[PDB]
Write a protein that binds this ligand. Structure first.
Ligand SMILES: Nc1cc(-c2ccc(Cl)cc2)n[nH]1
Length: 282
């Protein structure tokens, strides 16, 4: 079926939970043996969210190459994404090692450091220009260059230096600051505006490594971001845009990381975002 009228049909019939459970039942199951090794317990935020072995990002390190991060490679759309958990106190150095080694231009953050009175990720970037951060375990330096605070999101320019080679690179940090503590946004308008700002920066383009996107576990809000982006790109590429099937795209992405889209409300919000976005594109 088309999207917008499939949407109204699920609303009127109140069957979002059943649609979402079908997706959960059909989703791929692949091994995640490296994630479960005892030496990696303090590298995982949640025991039930792990990267598959076949798609995990490997650190270029012979001691321990593990990080909780997955490469989502979308062949027809010609887009790739790295989805990862919010960094932990003992993985902030690994996080920036990955950014460096994978040649990423942008980092997309969809959570606040504290939500619901608890810490959802480490404070992994500097908050003042004159107070830079040094990660001694991976030999990197990170400096805040500029910060632009808007009503729904903040953009930061960061300098990452490899202290071993003295090479430097500019990284863009796109921080969506207004996702509510509970539920999903009432309108997708600010989330779509944010997606377009990431696109306009070059951070999603083939001349760079894959964008790094995270929330707390790296599957819920993060899944919503890449699902909406990929569906909109396919609607532009194809002769028949109404042939884009959001459920089929989601199952393809779940071949590369488990659990993408965590609730039936997030699924409904993803439909809403693609529907409204397809009108603005034209
Ligand atoms: N004067 C000045 C420096 C910069 C700059 C420096 C370093 C990065 Cl990574 C990005 C921008 N903009 N303007």
């Amino acid at each position: 079926m088309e999207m917008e009228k499939e949407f109204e049909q699920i609303d009127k019939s109140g069957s979002w939970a059943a649609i979402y459970q079908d997706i959960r039942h059909e989703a791929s199951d692949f091994p995640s043996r490296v994630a479960k090794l005892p030496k990696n317990k303090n590298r995982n935020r949640y025991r039930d969210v792990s990267p598959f072995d076949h798609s995990r990002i490997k650190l270029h390190q012979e001691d321990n190459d593990y990080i909780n991060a997955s490469l989502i490679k979308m062949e027809e759309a010609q887009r790739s994404y790295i989805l990862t958990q919010g960094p932990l106190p003992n993985t902030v150095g690994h996080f920036w090692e990955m950014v460096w080694e994978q040649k990423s231009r942008g980092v997309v953050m969809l959570n606040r450091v504290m939500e619901k009175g608890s810490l959802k990720c480490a404070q992994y970037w500097p908050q003042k220009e004159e107070k830079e951060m040094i990660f001694e375990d991976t030999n990197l330096k990170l400096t805040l260059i500029s910060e632009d605070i808007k009503s729904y999101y903040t953009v930061r320019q960061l300098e990452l230096e490899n202290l071993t080679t003295q090479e430097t690179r500019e990284i863009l940090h796109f921080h969506y600051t207004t996702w509510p503590d509970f539920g999903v946004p009432e309108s997708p308008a600010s989330f779509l505006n944010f997606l377009f700002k990431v696109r306009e920066s070059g951070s999603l383009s083939p001349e760079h490594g894959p964008v790094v996107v995270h929330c707390s576990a790296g599957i819920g809000r993060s899944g919503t971001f890449c699902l909406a982006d990929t569906c909109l790109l396919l609607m532009d590429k194809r002769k028949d845009p109404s042939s884009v099937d959001i459920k089929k795209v989601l199952l393809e992405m779940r071949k590369f990381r488990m659990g993408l889209i965590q609730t039936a409300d997030q699924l409904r919000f993803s439909y809403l975002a693609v529907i409204e976005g397809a009108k603005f594109i034209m």
